[PDB]
Structure formats: C-alpha cells, structure tokens
C-alpha cells in the first residue's frame, strides 16, 4: 500500500510513544493524546490494541494505566472494540492451553491487566472465570494470591444465581488448599478471607 504504510507506521510509532512514557500517564492526559490519534483500520485498531497488550505484558504493574488506555480507544468506530479486546485476551489463553513454570509468572501478569479491563465492563464474566480456574489450577503462592486479590475485588459481580455452582466449586477447592497444609499459613488466612468474605454475601 505504501502512502498509507506509511500512516500506520506513524500511528503505531505514536502510540509507542504514549506507551513509553517511563511515568505512566493518567486518564485526562490520556484522553487528550489518544484524541490526536487516527485509527481508520481495522488493521490499525488491532494493531494499536496490539501493541498495548505487549506493553502490559512488560510491566504488568502499570495495568491500570494501560486498562484506562483501553478506556480510551474504545471511544472510536473502526470498519466492535471489546470483541477485539476479547479475542485478544482468549489469546493468551488459548495459547496458554498449548521453566514452564515461569509460564505463570507472565500469567499472573496477563490476569492482572485482563482484571483491570473487566472493571472497566469491557471483557466479559466469562473470560474472568477461565482466569480463575487457570490461578487455582497452579497452587502456587503467587497464584493464589493473586486469586485471593481477584475475587476480594471481583467476587460478588461473578458471583450470579447462575454462577452460583461454578463459584461453590471454586471456595470448596480454597477451603481443600487451607485443610491441607502444603501452603503457608499466611496464604491460608488469606484464602479464609475470601470464604469468610463470600460467607458473608460479600460484605466487609
């Protein structure tokens, strides 16, 4: 196509740069930059999508940012933005499902910024759910924290009447981790949290 590479090369080499502040931006600035920003493709806007996953999965702390970063972009029509998002969040999944065990550590970065954007209503319960069952499918600290911080956060919106029994599995497998104690009593008292919490109908 060649003019038009070269637009895309721009808008893609602009978004690298909104990304690559070292002091991560907030939403208002946020706003005003992805304003001065031209995705007209679909290539484009799965590109730019693209490139904000990669930079998640760099530094999964900065998340929030990149979540409202999403926030952002999803203000734009493009010849359907969440389905985008969600295919491109099934991918690590789906590819997740093909030192395997540093595997986790970049899953537990991925669910981090996969639970930014569902607070922010642009995935799905769903997806939410899988990221649960891939965190109690590796017991090991990390993950269960990171379970433990997810459903303290999230618990209740996932817990719907007809979510119910998924959810039951899932407190009946914590409660089978605290019984046996092949894991610190400090993620014990953690994981008796979340089903004291849920006990409670999600009440403090």
């Known amino acids: 196509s060649d003019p038009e590479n070269i637009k895309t090369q721009e808008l893609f080499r602009k978004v690298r740069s909104i990304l690559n502040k070292l002091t991560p931006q907030m939403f208002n600035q946020l706003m005003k930059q992805v304003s001065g920003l031209t ?18 999965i760099d530094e999964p702390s900065f998340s929030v940012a990149y979540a409202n970063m999403c926030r ?7 010849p359907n933005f969440r389905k ?7 991918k690590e999944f789906e590819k997740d499902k093909a ?3 540093k ?11 996969i639970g930014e954007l569902f607070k922010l209503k642009m995935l799905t319960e769903a997806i939410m759910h899988d990221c649960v069952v891939k965190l109690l499918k590796n017991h090991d600290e990390e993950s269960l924290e990171c379970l433990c911080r997810l459903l303290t956060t999230i618990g209740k919106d996932l817990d719907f009447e007809k979510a119910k029994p998924r959810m039951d599995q899932y407190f009946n497998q914590m409660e089978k981790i605290v019984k046996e104690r092949k894991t610190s009593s400090r993620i014990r008292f953690m994981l008796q949290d979340v089903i004291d919490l849920r006990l409670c109908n999600w009440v403090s």
């Open 103 to 113: 595997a986790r550590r970049r899953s537990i970065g991925n669910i981090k910024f």
């Open 39 to 56: 995705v007209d493709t679909e290539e484009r806007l799965k590109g730019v999508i693209d490139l904000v996953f990669e930079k998640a």
């Open 72 to 78: 952002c972009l999803v203000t734009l029509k493009v």
């Open 99 to 101: 030192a395997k065990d």
């Open 84 to 90: 985008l998002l969600l295919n491109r969040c099934q």
